[PDB]
Design a protein around this ligand. Structure first.
Ligand code: 6SU
Length: 284
């Protein structure tokens, strides 16, 4: 079926939970043996969220190459994304090592450091220009260059230096600051505006390594971001945009990381975002 009318048909019939459970039943199951090794317990935020072995990002290190991060490679859309958990106190150095080694331009953050009165990820970037951060375990230095605070999101320019080689690179930090503590946003308008700002920066383009996207577990809000982006790109590429099937795209992405889209409310929000986004692209 088309999307917008499949949408109204699920709303009127109140069957979002049944649609979402079908997705969960059909989703791929692949091994994640490296994630479950005892030496990696303090590298995982949640015991039930792990990268598959076949698609995990490897650190360029001979001691321990493990990070909780996955490469989502979308062949028809010609887009790639790295989805990862919010960094932990003992993985902030690994996080920036990955950004460096994978040649990423942008980092997309969809959570606040504290939500619901608890810590959802480490404070992994500097908050003042004159107070830079050094990660001694991976030999990197990170400096805040500039910060632009808007009503729904903040953009930061950061400098990452590889202290071994003295090479430097500019990294863009895109921080969506207004996702509610419970549920999903009422309108997708600010989330779509944010997606378009990431796109306009070059961070999603083939001349760079894959964008790094995270929330707390790296599967819920993060899944919504890459699902909406890929569906809108396919609607631009194809002769028949109504052929884009958001459930099929989601199942394809779940071949590369488990659990993408965590609730039926997130599934409904993803439909809403793609539907509204397709009108703004045009032609309008
Ligand atoms: C404050 O940092 C920024 O907003 C910033 C800095 C440097 C470059 C960009 N790129 S763009 C595509 O959003 O125009 C943004």
């Amino acid at each position: 079926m088309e999307m917008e009318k499949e949408f109204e048909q699920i709303d009127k019939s109140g069957s979002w939970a049944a649609i979402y459970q079908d997705i969960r039943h059909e989703a791929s199951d692949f091994p994640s043996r490296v994630a479950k090794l005892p030496k990696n317990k303090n590298r995982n935020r949640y015991r039930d969220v792990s990268p598959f072995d076949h698609s995990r990002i490897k650190l360029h290190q001979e001691d321990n190459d493990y990070i909780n991060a996955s490469l989502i490679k979308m062949e028809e859309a010609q887009r790639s994304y790295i989805l990862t958990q919010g960094p932990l106190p003992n993985t902030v150095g690994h996080f920036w090592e990955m950004v460096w080694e994978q040649k990423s331009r942008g980092v997309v953050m969809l959570n606040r450091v504290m939500e619901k009165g608890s810590l959802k990820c480490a404070q992994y970037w500097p908050q003042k220009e004159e107070k830079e951060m050094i990660f001694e375990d991976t030999n990197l230095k990170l400096t805040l260059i500039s910060e632009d605070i808007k009503s729904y999101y903040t953009v930061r320019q950061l400098e990452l230096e590889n202290l071994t080689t003295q090479e430097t690179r500019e990294i863009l930090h895109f921080h969506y600051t207004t996702w509610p503590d419970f549920g999903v946003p009422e309108s997708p308008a600010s989330f779509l505006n944010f997606l378009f700002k990431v796109r306009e920066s070059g961070s999603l383009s083939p001349e760079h390594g894959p964008v790094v996207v995270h929330c707390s577990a790296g599967i819920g809000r993060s899944g919504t971001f890459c699902l909406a982006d890929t569906c809108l790109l396919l609607m631009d590429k194809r002769k028949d945009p109504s052929s884009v099937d958001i459930k099929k795209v989601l199942l394809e992405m779940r071949k590369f990381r488990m659990g993408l889209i965590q609730t039926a409310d997130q599934l409904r929000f993803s439909y809403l975002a793609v539907i509204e986004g397709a009108k703004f692209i045009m032609g309008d």
